[PDB]
Amino acid sequence: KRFDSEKAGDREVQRTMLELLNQLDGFQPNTQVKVIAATNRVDILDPALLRSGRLDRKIEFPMPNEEARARIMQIHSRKMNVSPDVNYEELARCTDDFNGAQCKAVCVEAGMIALRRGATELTHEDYMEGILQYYA
Amino acid sequence: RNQYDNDVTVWSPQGRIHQIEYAMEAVKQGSATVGLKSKTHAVLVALKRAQSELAAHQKKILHVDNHIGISIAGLTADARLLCNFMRQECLDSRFVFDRPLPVSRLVSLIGSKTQIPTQRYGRRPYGVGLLIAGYDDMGPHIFQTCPSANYFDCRAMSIGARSQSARTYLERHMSEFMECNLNELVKHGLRALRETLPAEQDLTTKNVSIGIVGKDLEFTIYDDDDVSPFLEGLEER
Amino acid sequence: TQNPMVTGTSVLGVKFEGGVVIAADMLGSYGSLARFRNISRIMRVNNSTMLGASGDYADFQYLKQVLGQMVIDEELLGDGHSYSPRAIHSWLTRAMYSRRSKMNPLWNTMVIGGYADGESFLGYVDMLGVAYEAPSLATGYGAYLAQPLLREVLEKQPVLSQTEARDLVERCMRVLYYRDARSYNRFQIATVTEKGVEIEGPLSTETNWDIAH
Amino acid sequence: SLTTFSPSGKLVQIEYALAAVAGGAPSVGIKAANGVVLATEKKQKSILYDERSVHKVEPITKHIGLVYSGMGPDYRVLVHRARKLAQQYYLVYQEPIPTAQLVQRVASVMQEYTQSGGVRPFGVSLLICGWNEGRPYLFQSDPSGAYFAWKATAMGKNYVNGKTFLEKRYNEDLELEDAIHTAILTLKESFEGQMTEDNIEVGICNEAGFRRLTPTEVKDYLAAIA
Amino acid sequence: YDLSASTFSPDGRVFQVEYAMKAVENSSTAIGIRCKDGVVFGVEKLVLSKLYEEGSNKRLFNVDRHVGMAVAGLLADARSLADIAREEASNFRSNFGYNIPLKHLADRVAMYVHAYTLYSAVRPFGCSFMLGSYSVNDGAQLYMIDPSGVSYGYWGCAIGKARQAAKTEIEKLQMKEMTCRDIVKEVAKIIYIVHDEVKDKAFELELSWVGELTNGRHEIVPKDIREEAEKYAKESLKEEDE
Amino acid sequence: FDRHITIFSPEGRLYQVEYAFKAINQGGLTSVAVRGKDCAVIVTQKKVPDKLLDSSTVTHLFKITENIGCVMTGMTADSRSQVQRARYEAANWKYKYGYEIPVDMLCKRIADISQVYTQNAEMRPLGCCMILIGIDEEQGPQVYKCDPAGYYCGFKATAAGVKQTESTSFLEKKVKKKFDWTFEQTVETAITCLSTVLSIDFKPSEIEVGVVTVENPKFRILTEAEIDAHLVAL
Amino acid sequence: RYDSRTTIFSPEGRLYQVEYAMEAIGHAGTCLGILANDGVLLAAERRNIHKLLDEVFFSEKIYKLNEDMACSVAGITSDANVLTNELRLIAQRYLLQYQEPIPCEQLVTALCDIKQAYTQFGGKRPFGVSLLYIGWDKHYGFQLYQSDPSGNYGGWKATCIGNNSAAAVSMLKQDYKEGEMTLKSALALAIKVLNKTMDVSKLSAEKVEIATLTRENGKTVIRVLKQKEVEQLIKKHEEEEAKAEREKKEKE
Amino acid sequence: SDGFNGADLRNVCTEAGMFAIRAVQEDFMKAVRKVADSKKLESKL
Amino acid sequence: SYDRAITVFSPDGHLFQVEYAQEAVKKGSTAVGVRGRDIVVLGVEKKSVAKLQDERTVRKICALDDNVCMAFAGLTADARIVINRARVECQSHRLTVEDPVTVEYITRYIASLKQRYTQSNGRRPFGISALIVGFDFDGTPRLYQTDPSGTYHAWKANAIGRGAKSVREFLEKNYTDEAIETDDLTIKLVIKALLEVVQSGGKNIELAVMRRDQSLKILNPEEIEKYVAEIEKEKEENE
Amino acid sequence: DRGVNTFSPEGRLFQVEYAIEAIKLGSTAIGIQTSEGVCLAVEKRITSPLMEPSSIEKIVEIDAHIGCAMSGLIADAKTLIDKARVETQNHWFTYNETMTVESVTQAVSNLALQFAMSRPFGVALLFGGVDEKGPQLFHMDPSGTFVQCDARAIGSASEGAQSSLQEVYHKSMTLKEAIKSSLIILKQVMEEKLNATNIELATVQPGQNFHMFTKEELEEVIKD
């Protein structure tokens, strides 16, 4: 927000931010440049750094759907020595909010899991346990 | 996800509500139950778990009305409360009208209730997922209900842990579904449970409960022995 | 409802072999001060059921609105399930029984007609809650001097034709008009058949007094 | 929500309420021999404001006047409930509520509203005046539900210097006219800009009963003593 | 902070209603157009699981004989609000003997939403909706309602993910002077064109209307009519592709 | 601890009430009102995004009773809630006292209610400012603007919204010269004030203008015909 | 959230609220009471007697609960007001019930029970006031009692509370006999105690408030000493103090 | 129209040129698209 | 009203509140009780009182009936409230049945009260520990104890308070029917236990005893002086 | 997870989990069902000496045809058992019969489900009853999950006792074998020696009603 007055180091970050702003909003066409920014704390960011001559076209990364999870796991399995029997779509269904690289990590863990015994096939349930009383 | 994840009354800055997601997680943690149906028969094949070798398997098939049965997966306490509620509703409906309560109406009412304590800062959802097999004037009905109240009228559905194998089998064999005898109906449900269960584990006549409803047959429960003919006639691998 | 002030008169119903036909006058009365006439005591509950009353018209209208709302609810549901004539019969029985028990009875003697799935329904939910299912009904003071004819005719001939039933009900209501202080030469017939419910406007019978002279 | 006694034996929320009251519209009271005089800075924020709609000095009864410094809305609610309490007193006792009981009950209301969880205590200090009996009474009521009888006093932005000024000014021998002079002089020394007659509101309380002086009389007194 | 409905953010913005609209921005779509002699509704019912069935959970319902509505968002809140409007309409009918005006109905449901966003021990509804109705004495009327509870009379509108594209293709129409018959095919084209198959895989188009043709009664589009509209939408898709 | 609905900061400063004022300002539009010698007028911006809407369906003017008009500036839901609450209050007032509620009482009731909202830490101060216009037996064109904080102040000329301040300054300037206006003079003053503070020319469409006159104690939202007539005339 | 925590226990068995009330009482003005065989008395400091203050109410720290009992309050004045209203209610309900005045111990027990209910009933802060009662019961004659925010109460011959209560009570215990010191000398005892305790040796009727309960005509009488009487008690106290000082220095 | 930027013009023009290549830009009905785009960016912040 | 939950279970599975309450009871005064064949004795530390402090207003021991007597350890107001509740209950039981309340029944009632006040959805669990001694209408020297948590048990003797630990080990040791044969030597054992914390012979040990169905009686201070004198004679003889 | 009734992100209410922890901390009890009846043996937690065995009550009687053993909070068991007894007698009054053990157990669990009450009970119960289907044993946990078991063990030694029960139990024994094996395991798991005063032992048989064993038979079986 650039107005918080906590302590030092803050103000240094604000000069660096303002230098960024200058570098593309000043008396300079800056024609031969292409800035692409990447952030995760979407909400908390400088209102001026924000956009409209600075960071426009703010593409958004959503949570992958079932299809997206199926596609990502397929992509990571392309080089995997998968046997000719896969429920990729149903594994995507099992994902249940498995958005991030977790798909890649799971394909790797499945490789290691099969490698326990030296195999090339998908159990499809040891795959969930790689994924990761009372009633039931 | 710091904060934004206590009580249903708090809206996350993502359009998301997470207590409901947790309730659905508990639904998955519940045990496997598959419901499927033909023109005139609805079969719920359910895996009753064994907490201990000295403790009998937890029954999970409840006959609420003559023409309505439920298979539960999740908190047994909330399942019991909901079963009591549906029994009361069926009795009241029969009292007011000498009719079998329509399955769709019953499921809608249950969804409404389980929604009600999702908009007040004093209560919690019901982490219980139900598969309902009913037989109304329109015939057999298979419904799935979750804590979110998003009831789904399905040709064949599966809930609880390991439900994905049942989902796969049902999707594969839907074409056959709606075109099979009652025995084939039960056999397909049993095959779904076999796929869901670990390969080493096999459906004895102790782990399976079969609730069958349909024309000229009020919802009948088959446990212990009544499951025996189906398992005996069932195919193997 | 603890005062008899403004009602109509007796109502009639016959379980026609192919349907159910009921008749009721358009007399509103306040003790020899016949109130505005063209009120009727019959309405169409649904495509396969009709309601009629022979009690306090205000209570009858109240019942009409509540039941109309209920049936509208069922239709809106869109599930295809439709209230059965017997289901409505039971609902009404329960309603008047509860009102009686709590000491606010609904002052309406009921005549429920219906025809569902090729089955003809005929009910006589009375004041306190007494239920009935007979081929013929003569509710109100017209019971004594109408139900004998219907009963004997049905016993000697169970299955009846549409026109014969219509003529019999017209003759019976004509006798009612001859021998009723609170009758009226203007009545509605509501009939339910597989095709639906039809109300034949405000008909009047061909009453004759010179027959007795 | 107010139970949070700091680790000092004090209730910081009422402390803050007193601070806000201090940050309130200046008002002054002076009790004379035959009556009391109440005044307050009514300066609106523009000539736009209809300077006859929002009053600052309110007669709660034909012989009881009430003014405040602080929150206007809280003031409205408190004066309304004071009118109420006084009125039920009148009904039961077919006689106006004496200032003692009225202020006792108003302070009791203040405290009772202080003594719950979903309640934010009022932010007004009140300056009730009355002529019950042949005696004139002035009482300051504190957000903390404390009622103090007074001779003369000031509240608002400059209440401390108003208090010392009134200390040095007052003498038991003082007629209501000189009391008005003193109150208006206090408001002058505590006021910024000219005292346009209608930007200052004042009310007296005498044997004739409490009455808010009209713009005519307030203009007269200002143009005289200025 | 942005946790409870009490927290007026320093800007003066209550963040919980903003989060409610954010949640609303998850359902597929719900479009409607007020023809000169009625109202037409379409919706992009996404079959989440292939095992589901037609004639199942719907995002449109009937309130009274003379009102319909289409919803988009949390289906639980959707059904709750639909039933709600149901009983308000019924109670108005009980009180005054006639069908409630859509204006007053939208007013009351909007108040209900407004109260559940004001209070503290509750949460705002996670779904928006649109109310359509027709009468001879008052023409055809259409309204939309949001978690904040805004009731504005639209000649045509939509809600959901592709609300913006819905609005654009709505303004690409002489909504003032067409009838329900062609507007239904137009709505089918709307749904199909805005539909993102690449993302949603499965899909189904659900349609309905209420107008003079139906004597001011809301009903699903008949089977044949819906099939014809769907065929036209597919052919329009091929036209646009070529 | 200021996060609560109304809890004094160290020196007071009910931050949530101040935030309610900011919400009012962020309502998204602007309104102005004036009282003439015997006629009061009010104008307010009126936008029609997407070319849909329009009609009486979209608006911000509301007839609280047959003799009292009112305008809103704030979150539409909150404003309508206030409008209908005030309608309830006025109807009850007529049903109790038998006479149309004076605008002073109407604003007083809404002010007390909003004050209760602020007071109890359970009801939020709903973010909108209300303005009432009416005629009195012995005050003629009464205008009273009430705010969620609980002020019910009457202005010979008032304004609400983002440009409330600039509009107020302009109104002060104009009224400083011969406040004794006629109907046409008053309507011209209001319209021109709003035009000055918006720096926008006006078609009859994108505005709402209401009036009350002593001769005609009836709040009237002038139709597009009269709006354009006045606009083109001046 | 935002509910605070009133009726809760400290991790070390304690009640922050109760202790904060105790320290508030301590910071409050000083007061004390003495029980004598003849009668009972109670002295109280006046924190401020600012000349602008009026003198409408007969007392500024004391209230006559009835014709045979009175209380003195150290702490929040409004809390004290409501507490004494509750006391009047309880005692007069008792009188209605039994056609006779309530015993002091019973009234104290009732109010202390109410205090405990406040301390244990959800989010309602306990009253920040400590009470000192002087009464006459037919059972124990004259009686002096002290009650705290915790609900703890004790009937004592004499004690002090408020500011400098510790030093005041220490000196009192040092210089207090058991069954003597009638009002005539108890007045001087109280005056000297307050002179050493208030920490401003200059004492007059302006800064002090003295109440006395005595039995006469078979009926109780509670009276606050007039300014003249307070001033003569002052004068005599300083006189005997100067005496004792001169003999002590003579010995030295 | 709200905000302060004209870069909406660049966005519409570029994407509409892409549209035309897929198939001028007599498409103010399309410019309202990128107006809505910039306004959804406004919604983001 | 408040309707706010309290007494939340801890990660370990304990109740922080109840442990706080029991330690708050422990911090208080010490009191012992014992039962004989027909005598039930109950001694307790006086806890010091100013020469100006009336003991009548220190009632840390209360006769709830002719067969039940409770010694307190905690907060005096809590003592007063719980005592009044229990005594109203005993009179109510007299209404219900024309027999004196048994110690077992009264202890049940007190435990139920404790459970209610620890799980009544917003309450302050009574930081108190109670010791009751009675003789059933038939006559039985029964002695019961109740923890603040509500758990109560049957006890042939008890000792609760600050010294509860040490006095408990002491009494567990050197206790036998020889000691509890009769009123004789039983007061001596009690006084020896209380002097386990030494130097308070004349400042504490307010004592009461109840014979079988006869009555309860507070031991007068001349008698206490005689008992302590002969007890120290026994001591000096031992050494 | 924090909060009063908040659902923990990994499922469960987390107060059920706290209750399970409390039950585990609790003392140990064992119950065994046989066609000849059901036997209950509960280890006691007698504190320092001077304690009569009739001081801690870890066994209770439900009608003349069920016994119940507890593990956990004494007063929690007291309240739950009070409810169970009241419900049993109400059913007997309304039916001219006695509940089934399943039905009484599920009623008590139904009450336990409500978390008025702000916290789950800290007691786990074992009801050995005799009903239409002979002698049966029902284990109920604070979550409300009730199941009939052939042989159950609860408390501090819950897991070890359960393992021993699994090893020793077969579908065919009698009440005598049940009691002797239970006492063997109880001694093996006891806090100290088997003093015959630190245990409570009850049996309900198709015959003699529920019975508390007296000191004589306790010492007899102990030496056996």
Side-chain angles (χ1 to χ4, degrees), chain F residues 16-218:
Chain F
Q16 291 219 357
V17 188
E18 308 169 21
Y19 301 156
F21 269 23
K22 269 77 73 175
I24 298 153
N25 299 316
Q26 203 262 307
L29 295 171
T30 315
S31 72
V32 170
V34 176
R35 84 187 185 84
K37 193 167 160 197
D38 277 359
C39 312
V41 180
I42 60 172
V43 193
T44 309
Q45 187 178 8
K46 176 183 187 155
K47 209 255 187 174
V48 179
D50 84 4
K51 196 181 72 60
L52 319 167
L53 292 72
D54 210 326
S55 304
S56 80
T57 66
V58 66
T59 184
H60 284 284
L61 280 291
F62 313 92
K63 208 180 284 168
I64 297 304
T65 177
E66 295 307 334
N67 299 113
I68 309 173
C70 81
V71 56
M72 301 333 306
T73 60
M75 296 309 125
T76 175
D78 300 332
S79 65
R80 181 60 182 196
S81 174
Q82 266 197 350
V83 167
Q84 306 306 105
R85 183 68 154 72
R87 282 166 133 168
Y88 204 53
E89 288 300 331
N92 187 330
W93 192 287
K94 169 58 73 67
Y95 181 76
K96 213 155 70 168
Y97 300 174
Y99 81 103
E100 301 281 35
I101 185 173
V103 181
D104 189 2
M105 300 325 188
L106 192 52
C107 285
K108 195 185 277 283
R109 275 260 191 75
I110 293 89
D112 302 316
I113 293 146
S114 304
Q115 180 195 154
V116 164
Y117 285 168
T118 61
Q119 192 64 330
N120 290 355
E122 180 58 6
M123 284 73 74
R124 298 91 175 85
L126 60 94
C128 68
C129 166
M130 191 215 57
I131 316 166
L132 312 189
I133 308 297
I135 305 305
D136 171 21
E137 182 194 4
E138 276 89 4
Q139 203 175 338
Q142 282 167 343
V143 176
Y144 272 64
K145 179 257 280 178
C146 167
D147 61 359
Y151 279 65
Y152 69 101
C153 203
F155 302 169
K156 305 182 180 181
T158 187
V162 302
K163 305 312 305 194
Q164 156 176 355
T165 65
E166 286 77 342
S167 64
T168 48
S169 56
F170 182 76
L171 290 163
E172 176 69 37
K173 180 264 280 189
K174 187 61 163 65
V175 71
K176 273 307 315 181
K177 174 264 194 189
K178 300 290 94 176
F179 52 91
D180 299 325
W181 305 127
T182 65
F183 162 55
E184 281 66 359
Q185 299 156 349
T186 53
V187 60
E188 287 314 319
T189 46
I191 298 158
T192 311
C193 165
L194 192 153
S195 172
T196 47
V197 302
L198 272 294
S199 182
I200 288 172
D201 175 23
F202 293 96
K203 334 302 171 54
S205 170
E206 64 277 17
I207 52 162
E208 197 53 33
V209 305
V211 308
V212 300
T213 66
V214 163
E215 57 270 43
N216 192 351
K218 278 297 311 190

Side-chain angles (χ1 to χ4, degrees), chain I residues 18 68 70 102-116 128-133 142-158 160 168, chain J residues 44-47 51-60 70 72-79 81-82 85 200:
Chain I
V18 69
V68 285
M70 184 278 287
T102 71
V103 62
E104 192 275 349
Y105 162 84
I106 287 292
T107 318
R108 277 162 40 221
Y109 174 76
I110 291 298
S112 164
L113 176 60
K114 292 195 164 67
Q115 278 308 133
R116 284 182 42 214
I128 75 172
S129 297
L131 279 298
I132 310 303
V133 310
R142 300 314 315 288
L143 181 146
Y144 273 42
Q145 187 271 338
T146 80
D147 302 332
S149 180
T151 73
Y152 77 94
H153 306 287
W155 287 85
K156 292 179 182 179
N158 275 111
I160 51 151
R168 279 276 283 271
Chain J
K44 213 145 59 177
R45 192 52 48 80
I46 292 171
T47 61
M51 295 298 102
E52 60 274 37
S54 69
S55 285
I56 298 161
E57 297 72 17
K58 285 188 195 292
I59 286 301
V60 288
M70 65 179 288
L73 200 151
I74 303 305
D76 286 338
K78 293 278 175 55
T79 313
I81 295 288
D82 194 34
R85 298 168 156 169
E200 288 171 341

Side-chain angles (χ1 to χ4, degrees), chain B residues 53-115:
Chain B
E53 292 80 3
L54 278 290
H57 293 50
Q58 181 67 91
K59 56 158 182 54
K60 45 158 57 62
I61 307 312
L62 308 180
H63 173 111
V64 58
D65 196 352
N66 48 1
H67 69 300
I68 305 181
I70 304 100
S71 185
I72 50 165
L75 192 78
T76 314
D78 278 322
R80 204 177 290 93
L81 270 298
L82 269 68
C83 202
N84 272 116
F85 185 11
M86 283 74 74
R87 289 197 181 93
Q88 186 56 46
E89 293 179 353
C90 288
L91 288 188
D92 314 330
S93 67
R94 211 158 287 262
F95 178 25
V96 59
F97 325 116
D98 176 17
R99 79 182 194 162
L101 202 166
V103 178
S104 178
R105 200 164 313 188
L106 177 47
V107 169
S108 166
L109 276 296
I110 297 316
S112 79
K113 184 193 231 183
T114 184
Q115 177 273 1

Side-chain angles (χ1 to χ4, degrees), chain D residues 1 12-13 15-20 23 44 46-55 68 70-78 113 117-123, chain F residues 4 6-14 35 104 108 111-112 115-116 118-122 139 144 149-157 168-169 171-172 175-176:
Chain D
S1 180
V12 73
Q13 220 277 334
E15 290 195 349
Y16 298 168
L18 276 156
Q44 282 83 346
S46 285
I47 298 292
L48 311 170
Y49 301 179
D50 173 73
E51 59 276 19
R52 182 41 187 67
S53 58
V54 185
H55 292 276
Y68 83 113
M71 282 316 78
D74 294 15
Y75 172 63
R76 254 187 314 279
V77 162
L78 272 161
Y113 178 73
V119 288
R120 172 200 59 70
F122 298 113
Chain F
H4 315 108
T6 51
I7 290 298
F8 289 160
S9 71
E11 59 275 15
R13 298 286 75 78
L14 293 163
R35 84 187 185 84
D104 189 2
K108 195 185 277 283
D112 302 316
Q115 180 195 154
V116 164
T118 61
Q119 192 64 330
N120 290 355
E122 180 58 6
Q139 203 175 338
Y144 272 64
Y151 279 65
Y152 69 101
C153 203
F155 302 169
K156 305 182 180 181
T168 48
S169 56
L171 290 163
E172 176 69 37
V175 71
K176 273 307 315 181

Side-chain angles (χ1 to χ4, degrees), chain C residues 28-60:
Chain C
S29 162
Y30 182 30
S32 89
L33 185 61
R35 188 48 58 194
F36 303 170
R37 308 177 202 166
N38 192 4
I39 57 176
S40 83
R41 273 166 298 130
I42 303 160
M43 281 315 138
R44 177 264 208 187
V45 179
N46 69 2
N47 46 358
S48 74
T49 316
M50 72 274 285
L51 55 77
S54 179
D56 198 310
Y57 193 75
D59 292 354
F60 155 65

Side-chain angles (χ1 to χ4, degrees), chain A residues 51-104:
Chain A
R51 65 201 210 211
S52 302
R54 295 91 171 181
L55 294 174
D56 291 331
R57 283 68 161 172
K58 301 164 278 297
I59 284 297
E60 169 64 30
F61 281 22
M63 223 63 58
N65 64 7
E66 188 198 350
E67 184 207 357
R69 298 185 289 277
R71 295 310 90 172
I72 179 180
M73 61 79 71
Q74 280 184 348
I75 291 276
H76 288 112
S77 69
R78 292 193 175 182
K79 317 190 165 294
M80 271 285 258
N81 185 3
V82 187
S83 281
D85 43 355
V86 288
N87 297 115
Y88 45 91
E89 200 71 29
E90 290 58 21
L91 314 181
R93 193 185 276 91
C94 278
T95 48
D96 305 334
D97 198 339
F98 212 61
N99 46 1
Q102 314 94 15
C103 299
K104 174 177 149 161

